[PDB]
Design a protein around this nucleic acid. Structure first.
Ligand SMILES: [Zn+2]
Ligand SMILES: [Zn+2]
Ligand SMILES: [Zn+2]
Ligand SMILES: [Zn+2]
Lengths: 369, 370
RNA sequence: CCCACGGGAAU
RNA sequence: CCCGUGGGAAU
């Protein structure tokens, strides 16, 4: 029940390169469903509009007009709406959609965007935050979403979705950027489970890495209040990174995307695991070629990778990176800054300062040998 | 005018002069007919197209022949000069059919500019070019002036001027040298004497002529690679070619990778009228550096004082494995017999040959042992 | 045209 | 869609 879009149209418009000129149109594919996700789609429509402001002709506004009509022809139940948009919404449309969502708790909306539109201009940032604040889930389109869009909205003729190169690289950059803009906070239980520095008797291997950037201004380190969030490692996926991507590598990918100048910058990261050998070798390689950027790496635990991890940590120290185990100081900072604590002060786990001292000694042992 | 012009997208993709270029299964042939008078107007102009495959019923050369036979009988009998721009060089069958045509018609002379050489490594298409040149056809590679002239007379340009693609002169260099090899171009005897006389250069003219040959190692024999030997000169600076010029030693280095030599030991010999400058010798050193299966013999008629670091370059070149020697009567007779259009005449040495040869040989040692 | 890479701070 | 490269040994 969709007049599908040309496959040539989809490939050029849903290309998720974060910086991409020449696309003057916003494409919005949408579905309507019931409370039950398993059920079939009630309706589906495609909307297009030009980017520059005669803003009531953006596809977000056209959906609102169509949806009001469509609602008055259907019975009142709970509806789940999904958008695939080539560009994130403008400041005006975000308000108008936020307006809509408040007057209608029967409707919940999830927005998958391919690219972030003007993610560096603070107008469009508030547009996204206002939209999430009004209840809308806001995610970046990934392979599964691009393929699902190709299936339902594109005149593919049975031809399969074929991803472009650098699709996961772009998803990485855009997801972290959205996390920064929306100020995604870590779940408080998640932080405690992964940053407790007692010996790891558990089976879950995942790495969470918090990051912040400061600039040297006069003799003070001034926070770049725009570049701080957290990220975790990418599970292996044939439709993404086939061998996974460790959190240290995704963090290295972000730094060039920030477009930092030649000034003095200090990038601080708090990782639940010390890097393995290959990740530490890439980080050392980085500060090697960027001596205007210093790098402070605090780790909650030392990752024994059953390999050359001790050599990687030494390589990291010899090349200018600060390497230290997190003490109570850092654990409280991460709690207060990156966790969805909601007032609660930092509640230390048992043996924090003791495990912290023990790891600090073991880390020195690695570096002085 | 009286041409149904071709789409500019067609011209840009089809007349691209990259020597190795797949995906172009069509031969485009733009041709003009003119009179004895060069100033005179074009009588008629036509575009012909045909498929590349040897089985295609009418290659564009054959379609021209049929069209010209009709067109001739509608015009009075005079002398005609025909010009072709062809995206691909001709096959052997069309070459014979055109060669047959020109012999039975001395009133017609034909010049063929090709954009790319088709199968220049297979002796069929090589023989095709020699068949055609021998029957009187001028055979040249298209350069900037021709690509532009083709764009003006045959292309639906919409007033927009011809805009050359990148590496047009890089490609032209390779294709021009290849054609000279295939057609067995020989040097003009006056040019050879003027540039290789080893007396002190009292003239103002600085240009470099460089002869080249390849030898192959078989057991302990240097067996001539009788397929890659010719001559070339340095490219003067031109905004529509190499804007900063191209020294002849560099054009010689460009050829060697294009030859696609095997892993065997190969010795590429060159006889240059001038010793390399410092930067050219430094590039030659870089080459023998990165190719230790290829050795390099450089014989020079005269030592080039470049008002710079040339003596260091000559020292670096001899150290890194390249042989450097001055041409003696030995070498001068070889180059005359091999690369010059002598037509029987034996080598007549200029005055003071061996003396200038010995005098420069001493000056070269002085460079090498200091 | 086929393949790979880089770039687009984006009416 | 635009720009800059590299590769086409050539149905
Ligand atoms: Zn808008
Ligand atoms: Zn790692
Ligand atoms: Zn033919
Ligand atoms: Zn030179």
């Amino acid at each position: 029940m969709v007049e599908p879009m040309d496959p040539r149209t989809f490939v050029s418009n849903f290309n998720n390169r974060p910086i991409l000129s020449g696309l003057d149109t916003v494409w919005l594919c949408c579905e309507v469903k019931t409370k039950d996700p398993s059920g079939p789609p009630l309706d589906a429509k495609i909307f297009q509009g030009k980017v520059y402001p005669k803003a009531k002709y953006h596809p977000e506004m056209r959906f609102l007009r169509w949806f009001h009509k469509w609602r008055q022809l259907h019975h009142d139940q709970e509806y789940k709406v999904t958008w695939y948009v080539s560009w994130s919404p403008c400041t005006r449309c975000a308000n108008s959609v936020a307006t809509f969502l408040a007057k209608d708790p029967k409707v919940t909306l999830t927005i998958f965007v391919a690219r972030l539109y003007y993610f560096w201009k603070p107008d469009y940032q508030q547009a996204l935050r206002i939209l999430a604040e009004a209840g809308a889930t806001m995610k970046i389109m990934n392979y599964n979403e691009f393929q699902d869009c190709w299936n339902k909205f594109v005149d593919g003729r049975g031809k399969p979705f074929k991803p472009w190169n650098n699709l996961p690289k772009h998803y990485t950059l855009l997801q972290a950027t959205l996390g920064e803009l929306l100020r995604h906070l870590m779940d408080p239980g998640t932080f405690t489970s992964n940053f407790n520095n007692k010996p790891w008797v558990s089976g879950q291997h995942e790495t969470y890495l918090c990051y912040k950037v400061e600039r040297l201004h006069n003799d003070t380190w001034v926070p770049l209040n725009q570049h701080r969030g957290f990220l975790r490692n990418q599970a292996p996926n044939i439709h993404g990174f086939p061998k996974g991507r460790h959190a240290a590598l995704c963090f290295l990918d972000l730094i060039p995307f920030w477009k930092l100048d030649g000034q003095q910058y200090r990038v601080t990261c708090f990782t639940s695991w010390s890097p393995c050998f290959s990740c530490a070798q890439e980080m050392a390689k980085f500060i090697s070629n960027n001596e205007h950027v210093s790098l402070c790496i605090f780790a909650a635990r030392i990752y024994d990778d059953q390999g050359r991890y001790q050599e990687g940590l030494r390589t990291l120290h010899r090349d200018g990176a600060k390497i230290a185990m997190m003490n109570y100081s850092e654990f409280e900072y991460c709690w207060d800054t990156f966790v969805d604590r909601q007032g609660r002060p930092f509640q230390p786990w048992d043996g924090l300062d003791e495990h912290s001292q023990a790891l600090s000694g073991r880390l020195r042992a690695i570096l002085q040998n």
